[PDB]
Write a protein that binds this ligand. Structure first.
Ligand SMILES: [Mg+2]
Length: 499
C-alpha cells in the first residue's frame, strides 16, 4: 500500500495505534512544527511521545474527574516520581489513580511556573509515557469505547520471544543479556542511568557525546534529565579530538555515547577505535544501532551496551513503541549492568510487547529488501545532480570505511538516506508520493523533513540557521526511509518528484 499520496492529517498507517501521520507539504510541516492552531486541527495526530494520543488524553480527563481541576500520565509510578523530582514538584505531585479496574500513574502539573514543561520534557525524552494500547484497554474495560483495534499479535510469552529474537540478532548468549524498555528513548535513558550509577563510586560522572545524534538523546544530556556533566565532540570522525577530550577528563569519564549511523546526519563512527579509547579511559561505550539494525552490523564486540528503538525497522509496522538494551557479555561492566538495569526504565505494556513479538518475526527478511531498495535509490539520487546536492548514508565516501569495520558479511546499508537538496524542499517534498511524516522504519517508504522535526526553532532565524550549518544541516533536506516495495517502483516514484 506504499508509494501513494496520503491525505493530510490521516494517521499513518491507519491503525488506532499509528505512530505517524500524513504531513504531505512543507506548508503543513511549518504549520505543524510552529503549532499553528488551524494546522493542528487538520493534522491533530502525531508521534505518541510528542502529541498525546486521544485515548491517553481521555483517560487523564476521566481519572481526574474521580483535586478535580492538568494530569500527565506515565507508564509507571517510578516514571511519575522521576518526572516530578526532575520538574521540582512536591513529591505528592506523583499520584496513583484508578479507572475501569486499572491503576494509573501520573503527575499533577502546576498551572503556573516551568514545572509543567519540565515534567512533560522528562516523560518525553525518556519515553516514560502511557501507551495507547494500555489506554485503549482502560477505556474498553470501563465501557467507554465500543471496540478495540484489531491487529496481529503473538501473545504467548511475548517478552521472552522478543528478547530471544534480539539475542540471536545481536549474537549474545540469550535473553538474560536483553532488557526490553518502554520505547527506544526509555532504553537509551536506562542504559545511560545504569552506566552512570555503576561509575559513580569511582568518581566518573562525565559523558562524551560523539557527534550530533538523535535529538531526544541530546536533550537528555543538555536538559540534565540525566544529571551528569557532558561534552559534545561535534565531528564523529574526529578521533584525535575524541582522545583529546577524553584525556582532559582522564579518570572522570563515565561513558561515551555514539550512534551508528547517526540520526539524521548519517555519520558512521569508528567503533573499533572508540573501543580502544574507552578501554584507556575506563569508561563504557554505549552505542545506539537503531539505524543500521543488528542484521547489518555486529557492534556487540565493540560496545559495552547497545540500544535499539524497536519502533522502527524491528517491527516495520509504524504502530508500536518499544526499546531494547543489550549488554555485551564480555564487558567489564556486564555483571554490574545486569544487577543495576532493573532499577531504570520500564518494560513495555505487555500488549505492546505482543505486537512487537508478531512483527519482529520478519525482521531479517525485511532488511534484505530494505537494503536492496536503499542501494537502488542511492544510485538514482546520484543521477540527479541538478536537484540533489549530496546524499549522506552509510556507504557514502565519509562513512563507508568506518561502516565496513562492523558490517556483517551479509550486511547492507539499512534503509535511511539523508538527502540534501539544491532546490527548496517544497519542489520535491510536496509532490513526492510516499508517506510523509514523523518516524521511520516501516515496510512502506517514508520521508521526513527532518530538520523541521528536530530543529524548527533553529530554522527560524539567521543565527539559528548558522548553528545548523555548523552541524552540516539546513532547511532543504529530506530523510528517506525506504520500505520493502519493488526497487523499480521506489526509483520511479523519486524520479517523478525530482524532475
Ligand atoms: Mg553534507
Amino acid at each position: 500500500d506504499g508509494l501513494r499520496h496520503i491525505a493530510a492529517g490521516r494517521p499513518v498507517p491507519g491503525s488506532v495505534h499509528s505512530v505517524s501521520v500524513s504531513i504531505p507539504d512543507v506548508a503543513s510541516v511549518i504549520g505543524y512544527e510552529s503549532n499553528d492552531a488551524a494546522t493542528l486541527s487538520r493534522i491533530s495526530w502525531g508521534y505518541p511521545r510528542f502529541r498525546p494520543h486521544p485515548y491517553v488524553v481521555r483517560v487523564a480527563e476521566l481519572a481526574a474527574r474521580e483535586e478535580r481541576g492538568a494530569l500527565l500520565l506515565t507508564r509507571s509510578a517510578r516514571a511519575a516520581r522521576a518526572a516530578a523530582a526532575y520538574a521540582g514538584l512536591p513529591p505528592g505531585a506523583a499520584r496513583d489513580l484508578t479507572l475501569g479496574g486499572h491503576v494509573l500513574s501520573g503527575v499533577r502539573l502546576p498551572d503556573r511556573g516551568p514545572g509543567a514543561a519540565r515534567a512533560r520534557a522528562h516523560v518525553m525524552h525518556t519515553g516514560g509515557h502511557l501507551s495507547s494500547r494500555q489506554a485503549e484497554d482502560v477505556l474498553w474495560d470501563a465501557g467507554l469505547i465500543d471496540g478495540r483495534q484489531v491487529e496481529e499479535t503473538a501473545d504467548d510469552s511475548p517478552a521472552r520471544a522478543v528478547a530471544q529474537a534480539l539475542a540471536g540478532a545481536y549474537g549474545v548468549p540469550g535473553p538474560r543479556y536483553v532488557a526490553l524498555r518502554n520505547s527506544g528513548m526509555n532504553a537509551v535513558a536506562a542504559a545511560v542511568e545504569a552506566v552512570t550509577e555503576i561509575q559513580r563510586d569511582s568518581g566518573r560522572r562525565h559523558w562524551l557525546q560523539l557527534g550530533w545524534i538523535y535529538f531526544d538523546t541530546m536533550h537528555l544530556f543538555e536538559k540534565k534529565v540525566v544529571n551528569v556533566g557532558h561534552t559534545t565532540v561535534p565531528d564523529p570522525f574526529d578521533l584525535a579530538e575524541v582522545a583529546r577530550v577524553a584525556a582532559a577528563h582522564a579518570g572522570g569519564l563515565a561513558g561515551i555515547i555514539a550512534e551508528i549511523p547517526s540520526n539524521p546526519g548519517m555519520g558512521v563512527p569508528d567503533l573499533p577505535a572508540l573501543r580502544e579509547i574507552a578501554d584507556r579511559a575506563g569508561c563504557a561505550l554505549v552505542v545506539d544501532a537503531t539505524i543500521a539494525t543488528p542484521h547489518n552490523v555486529d557492534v556487540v564486540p565493540y560496545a559495552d551496551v547497545v540500544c535499539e528503538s524497536l519502533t522502527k525497522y524491528a517491527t516495520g509496522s509504524a504502530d508500536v513503541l518499544a526499546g531494547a538494551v543489550v549488554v555485551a557479555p564480555g564487558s567489564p561492566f556486564a555483571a554490574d549492568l545486569l544487577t543495576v538495569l532493573p532499577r531504570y526504565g520500564d518494560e513495555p505494556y505487555r500488549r505492546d510487547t505482543a505486537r512487537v513479538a508478531a512483527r519482529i518475526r520478519g525482521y531479517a527478511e525485511r532488511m534484505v529488501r530494505v537494503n536492496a531498495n536503499a542501494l537502488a535509490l542511492a544510485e538514482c539520487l546520484r543521477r540527479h545532480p541538478d536537484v540533489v546536492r549530496d546524499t549522506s548514508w552509510a556507504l557514502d565516501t565519509r562513512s563507508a570505511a568506518n561502516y565496513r569495520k562492523v558490517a556483517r558479511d551479509s550486511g547492507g546499508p539499512g534503509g535511511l538516506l539523508m538527502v540534501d537538496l539544491e532546490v527548496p524542499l517544497e519542489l520535491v517534498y510536496d509532490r513526492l508520493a510516499v508517506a510523509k511524516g514523523p518516524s521511520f522504519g516501516a515496510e512502506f517508504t517514508m520521508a521526513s523533513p527532518q530538520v523541521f522535526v528536530a530543529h524548527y526553532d533553529l530554522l527560524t532565524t539567521p543565527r539559528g540557521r548558522a548553528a545548523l550549518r555548523a552541524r552540516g544541516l539546513h532547511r532543504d533536506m529530506l530523510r528517506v526511509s525506504v520500505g520493502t516495495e519493488p526497487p523499480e517502483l521506489i526509483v520511479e516514484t523519486f524520479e517523478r518528484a525530482l524532475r
